[PDB]
Ligand binder design. Structure first.
Ligand SMILES: *[C@H](C)[C@H]1/C(=C/c2[nH]c(/C=C3N=C(/C=C4\NC(=O)C(CC)=C4C)C(C)=C\3CCC(=O)O)c(CCC(=O)O)c2C)NC(=O)[C@@H]1C
Ligand SMILES: *[C@H](C)[C@H]1/C(=C/c2[nH]c(/C=C3N=C(/C=C4\NC(=O)C(CC)=C4C)C(C)=C\3CCC(=O)O)c(CCC(=O)O)c2C)NC(=O)[C@@H]1C
Ligand SMILES: *[C@H](C)[C@H]1/C(=C/c2[nH]c(/C=C3N=C(/C=C4\NC(=O)C(CC)=C4C)C(C)=C\3CCC(=O)O)c(CCC(=O)O)c2C)NC(=O)[C@@H]1C
Lengths: 160, 161, 158, 159, 161, 160, 161, 159
C-alpha cells in the first residue's frame, strides 16, 4: 500500500515521515473512496471480463489452444482462465491499496520460474492481461479506466 | 563431505593401520559400481528440469497446496518449492557419485527440519515430492542405477521425516 | 426420445411400459432446460464458428494452402459454412434429446459427399472438435457435458 | 492371371473351359513374350520413374509435403516414395500376368481402410500413380505404353 | 452373455438363496461405478479410430510385419489386422460397461488361439497391440476409468497368450 | 579446456598443480588423439547432421514452423538451422578441449536472455540439439558416441 | 520345453538381434519372481496328496460320477481320475517354475481333448476339478504366489475346454 | 536354461522337482542379475571383439585368407566375420541362460556337417572363437571373465 511504502522509505532513512511523504498519504486517503468504487465495478464484471479476455487471447494466439499448446484441452483451458481470474483479483487489490506491492508479492515474484516449470509461454499470459485491460477499460469511465490501466500495465510489464 | 574411498581411508587412519586387503576389497567394490553411477549422474543432470516438473505434477500441483491458503500458493512460494526440489535432486546426484550418504547429512539434512517448522512448510508433502522424484529418476536411470539412486532419495526422505 | 420409446414398443408389439413412460415424463421436464442450453449456443454461434475455424486452420495449415481444398476465399467460406451447419445440427440434437435429427441431416452419406468434394474427412472432424471446445467454455459445466455428448457423436460419426 | 480368372469362372459354373475362354488363353500366351519385355523396361527405369513421379506429385500437391500434410518430413516423404515404388512393382506383375488380379490382391483390397487409418489422402496417392504412368509412357514405345496404361489406369480407378 | 448384476443373481439362484446384504453390497458397488463406465465408453467410441491408429504406430507399423514377408504385409492383411484391433476395442468397451469378462470369453476369446495358429498370425504381436491400445485408452478415459478399462484389456491379452 | 580448468583452480589456491590434477592432464593428452578423430567425423558430417536434425525438430514441433511460430518462413527457418549449426560447431570445440568451458562462454551464458528477446522458445531449441545428438550418435562408433553425448547433454541441460 | 528366459532368447534369435536392455528388463523381472515361485513349488509338492483330496471332495466325489454308471465309478476308474488330477497339478507346478505355459501345450494339452472324447471322460467335470485344485492351491501358496499359480491352472482349463 | 534342464529331468522321472534341484534354481535366479551385466558388457564391446579376433585369426592362419583359402576375397572375409559375430551372440545368450543348451541348439549341432559342405576348416573356426575369448576376457573383470570363458571354451570344444 502507499502507507507501507512511505513507512519503509522513512525507516531506511531512519527519520520521521517527511512533509512531502505526508502529503502523498493525504492525497491517497482522499482518492480511496473513488478507488473503492473502481474496484467494486471490476469485481461485479469479473466473470464477463475473464470470459471476454480469454476469447480475445485465444483469437490472438491460436497456438496456445492447439494440441501442442499448453492451454489445449478443457482442463488446461480452465486453468488458463483461472490464472486470468487470479490476476484480475490482484489488480482489484492493487487499486484499493494504491500501490502494486500487494499485487507484486502474490503474483509477480517468481512468476517467471513458476511458468517456466509449467512451460506456459510468458508472452501469451501478458497478452491475456492486456486483453483483460481492454475489456475492463470499456466498462470503466475514462478517468477510472486510466487509474485501472496503470495497474494493468504494471502486470504486463512485470511478466513479459 | 566424505566419499566411500575417503571413508575407508579415515577408518584406517584413526586405527593408524596401513591399508589391508579387506579394506582394498571394499574400495574395489566401489570402483566397479563407479562406472554405472557416472552414467546415471549424466542422465539425471540432462533431465533434471523435467524430473522436477513430472514430480510436481504427480504430487504438488493441482492440489490444496497450490490453491489459495495452501503453502505453495503465490508465485513466490511456488518458486521456492521448486527450488528446494532442485536442491534435493542435485545433492542426491552428488551422493550417488560419492557412494556415501554423509554429504546429505552435512549439507541438506542439517537444520532442515527446524527451518521447515519455522517456515510452516509441510514436511510430509515435501517427503512425498522427494519420493515422486525418486520414481521418475528410477525410470530414466534404468534398473541397475535405480537401486543405487533410490537409497539416497530414501535417506533424504527419512531425514526430513 | 419419445419416438425411440414408441418404436421399441412397436417392435415388441406391446403398450409402453410404465418405466418407459416415466422416462418420457422426465424428458419432457428436462426439455425446457435443454432449450436454454441450445439458446446459449445459438447466440454464441457466430463466434464459436469463427474461433473453431481459426483453431482448425492452425492445426491443419495444409487445408488452407494452394494444394488444399479450403484454400481461397470462396473455399474458406464454404468450410466455415459447413462448420455452421454442423453447429445448427447439434443445437437441434440437444432440444430433441436424441442424435437422430443430427444423424439424418449430417451423418448419413457424409463420407460419400465429402469424397466427391475431395474434402478431407479428418480435418472436418477436427473442426467439430474445435467447435466443441469453444462451446464448452461458454456453457456451464453440467450444460457442457450434455452438449459434449452430441459433439462427440458427430466426431465419432465423421 | 488370365488363366486363373478363366478357371475360376469355369469352376463356379462347374463346366469345362468355354471355347471363347480358351481362345483368350491362346492369345495371352502369344502376347506374353512382348509383355515380358514391357515389364523388363519399366523395371530398369523403375528408380527414375519413381523419382520423377514424386517430384511431379509434390508440385501438383504442395500441401501433402507441408507441416500439416502427411507426407511432410524426410521419414514421411521416404514412405510416400516407397509406396509409389510398391505400386510400380505391382503394375509390372500385372503386365506379365495379363490381369489385374495379382495387383488387386496385394494392393487394392482394403487400401481405403489402410490409408484412412494412416490418414493419407487417397486422391493424392492416385495423382502419384498418374504421374508414374506419364513417366513410364514416355520411356515405353506407343503400343507398349497403351498396354502399360491400362494397368496404370486400373490402379488409379481402384483408389 | 452375463453382466455383474446378473452374475450376482445367478450365484444366488443356484444356492436358492434370497438376495442378502453381502450380495446387495456387490450390487451397490456396481451401481456407483456405473456412471463412470458410461462416460468412459462414450470417450472410447468417439476416439476409436485414433486409438487404433496410435496403437498400431506404437507396435505394428514401421516394423518387419508391415515389410514384405511380414504377416501384415499387403493391403488386405493390413486391413484385416486393424479390423481385428477394432473388434478387441469394441468388446473391451462392452465388457467395461457390463462389469463382467464373460462376453469376451463367449465371443472373442473362444477359438481365437486356434484360429490364429492356423492363419499364422503372430499371437505375441497381437498381444502387444492390445497392450498398446490399453495405454492409449487409459489416457483418454482418465485414471478412475482407466483401472476398470485395464482389467478387460488384460483379460483379452491373457486369453490370447 | 581441461588444462585451463586445472590451472585456474591452482592459481586460486596459490599452489603448484596437485599430483591428482597432473594425472588428469596426463589422461587428457592421451585421450586427445581419439578426441580429434571424433571431432573430425562430426565436422565432415556437419551439413547432413544439421539438415536431418532440423527435419526431426520440425516433425516433433509442427508449431515452430507455423504462421504463429518463430521458425515459420524461409528466412526464419534458415536462421533456425544456422543456430543449430552454431551449436554443432561449439560441440566439436568442446570435444577437442575436453571441457564444456569453450562451449559455455560462446553459447550458454546469456542464452536465455537472448532467446527471450528473440521470442524463440527455449525448449524447442533444446529439442533441436537433442535431435542433432541422435544423428551424430548414429555416425559415431558407440564409445565415440558416448563421449560426444556428454557434450550434447550439457547443451541440452544448459538450455532448459 | 521353453521357459521365460529361453523364450526371450528365442525371440531375439529369430530377429538375429543381440540381447538388449529392454530384453534384459524382462529377464530381470523373471529373476525377482523366481524366488517366490520356488517357495510355492515346494509347498505344492508337500501338500499334493491333500490338494487332490480336497479338490475331489469339492467337485468329483459324492456325485453321479462316483455313482454306478458314472465315469469315475469302479476302483479302476476312480484311480485313473485321481492320477489325471495329479498330472495336471505336477505340470502346473512345472509351468509356474518355468514362467511359461508352453510345457502345458507340449505335454498335457495336445491331443487330450480328442483322447477324452473317445474315452467318454467328461471334459467339463475335469475342468471343474482343475478349478477346484486351483482354489485349494491358492490358499496354501499364499497371495503373491497364488496369482502366478492361477494363470497356469486357467491355461489348462481353457485348453481342455 | 538351468531351470528348463531341471524341469525336463523331473518330467522324465515323472516326479515333482527335488529339493536339491530347487536349490540350484534358487542359486541361478540370484546369479542372474550379475550374469545380465556380464552379457551387457560383451554386447557393447561386440563390434570391436569381432574385429580384433578376426585380425588375430588371420595372422594365426595366413592360409584361410589366401587365394586357395575359403576366407579369401571381400565377400568371403565378410562371411567369416559374420560367423564370428553369430557365435558371439550365441555366447551372450548362453551367459544369461546359465546353460550351453541355447548355444548348442543354434550353433553346435550339425556344425561339422555344415562346414564340411562349405569346405571351411573347422580348426580355423575354433581358433577364431579362441581369439574372441581372449579379447572378451580382457574387457571383462576376472570373475566375470571366468564365467564367460566357460561358454567360450564349450564352443571351442564343440568345433
Ligand atoms: C492462460 C493465460 C495461460 C495458461 C495458464 C495455465 N496455468 C496453469 C497452471 C498453473 N497456473 C498457476 C498460476 C498461479 N498460481 C498462483 O499463485 C498465481 C498468482 C495468484 C498464479 C497466476 C499455477 C500455480 C498452476 C499449477 C497448477 C495448479 O494451479 O495447481 C496451466 C496448466 C499447467 C500444466 O499444463 O502443467 C495453464 C494452461 N497457460 C497458457 O498457455 C495460457 C496462455
Ligand atoms: C505417397 C504417394 C502418399 C503417402 C504415403 C505414405 N504411406 C505411409 C505409410 C504406409 N504406407 C503403407 C502402404 C502399403 N503397405 C503395403 O503393404 C502396400 C501395398 C504393398 C502399401 C501401398 C504402409 C504399410 C504404411 C505404414 C507404415 C509402414 O510403412 O510400415 C506414410 C506414413 C504414414 C504415417 O503417418 O506414419 C505416408 C506418408 N502419403 C501421402 O500423403 C502421399 C500422397
Ligand atoms: C467302511 C467299511 C469303511 C469306510 C468307508 C468309506 N467309504 C467312503 C467313501 C467312498 N468309498 C467309495 C468306494 C467305492 N466306490 C467304488 O466304485 C467301489 C467299488 C465298487 C468302492 C468300494 C467311494 C467311491 C467313496 C467316495 C464317496 C462317494 O461315494 O462318492 C467314506 C467316506 C469318504 C470320506 O472320507 O468322506 C467312508 C467312510 N470308512 C471306514 O473307516 C470303514 C472302515
Amino acid at each position: 500500500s502507499v502507507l507501507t511504502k512511505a513507512i519503509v522509505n522513512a525507516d531506511a532513512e531512519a527519520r520521521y515521515l517527511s512533509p512531502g511523504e505526508l502529503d502523498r498519504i493525504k492525497s491517497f486517503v482522499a482518492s480511496g473512496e473513488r478507488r473503492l468504487r473502481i474496484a467494486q465495478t471490476l469485481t461485479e464484471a469479473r466473470e464477463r471480463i475473464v470470459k471476454q479476455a480469454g476469447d480475445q487471447l485465444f483469437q490472438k494466439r491460436p497456438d496456445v489452444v492447439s494440441p501442442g499448446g499448453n492451454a489445449y484441452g478443457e482442463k488446461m483451458t480452465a486453468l488458463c482462465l483461472r490464472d486470468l481470474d487470479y490476476y484480475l483479483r490482484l489488480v482489484t487489490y492493487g487499486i484499493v491499496a494504491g500501490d502494486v506491492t500487494p499485487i507484486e508479492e502474490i503474483g509477480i515474484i517468481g512468476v517467471k520460474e513458476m511458468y517456466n516449470s509449467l512451460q506456459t509461454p510468458i508472452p501469451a499470459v501478458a497478452e491475456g492481461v492486456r486483453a483483460m485491460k481492454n475489456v475492463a477499460t470499456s466498462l470503466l469511465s475514462g478517468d477510472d479506466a486510466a487509474e485501472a490501466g496503470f495497474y494493468f500495465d504494471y502486470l504486463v510489464g512485470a511478466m513479459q | 563431505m566424505q566419499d566411500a574411498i575417503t571413508a575407508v581411508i579415515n577408518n584406517y587412519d584413526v586405527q593408524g593401520k596401513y591399508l589391508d586387503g579387506a579394506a582394498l576389497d571394499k574400495l574395489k567394490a566401489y570402483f566397479t559400481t563407479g562406472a554405472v553411477r557416472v552414467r546415471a549422474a549424466a542422465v539425471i543432470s540432462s533431465n533434471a528440469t523435467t524430473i522436477i516438473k513430472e514430480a510436481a505434477a504427480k504430487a504438488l500441483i493441482y492440489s490444496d497446496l497450490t490453491r489459495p491458503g495452501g503453502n505453495m500458493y503465490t508465485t513466490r512460494r511456488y518458486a521456492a518449492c521448486i527450488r528446494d526440489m532442485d536442491y534435493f535432486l542435485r545433492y542426491a546426484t552428488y551422493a550417488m557419485l560419492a557412494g556415501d550418504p554423509s554429504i546429505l547429512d552435512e549439507r541438506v539434512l542439517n537444520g532442515l527440519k527446524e527451518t521447515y517448522n519455522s517456515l510452516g512448510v509441510p514436511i510430509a508433502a515435501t517427503v512425498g515430492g522427494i519420493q515422486a522424484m525418486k520414481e521418475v529418476v528410477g525410470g530414466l536411470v534404468g534398473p541397475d542405477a535405480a537401486k543405487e539412486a533410490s537409497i539416497y532419495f530414501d535417506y533424504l526422505s527419512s531425514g526430513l521425516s
